[PDB]
């Protein structure tokens, strides 16, 4: 099971990331997995 607003070292299908998970108001398609900003840090992830 996943957590919301509770920092963890989450592994979304091989993607290891740390931080707080907050709901996103920008919506791509779920198959479109993740993006990166100007700093190239991962910005979002979709869970199965």
């Amino acid at each position: 099971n996943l957590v919301k607003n509770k920092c963890v070292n989450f592994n979304f299908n091989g993607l290891k990331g740390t931080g707080v998970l907050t709901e996103s108001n920008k919506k791509f398609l779920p198959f479109q997995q993740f993006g990166r900003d100007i700093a190239d840090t991962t910005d979002a992830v979709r869970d199965p």
Binding site: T18, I38, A39, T41
Partner: peptide
């Protein structure tokens, strides 16, 4: 402001934009 553009640390200015 309009024209300017993990493991990274930025410390806030001791004098923020407001105080500057």
């Amino acid at each position: 402001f309009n024209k300017v553009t993990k493991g990274l640390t930025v410390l806030p200015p001791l004098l923020t934009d407001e105080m500057i």
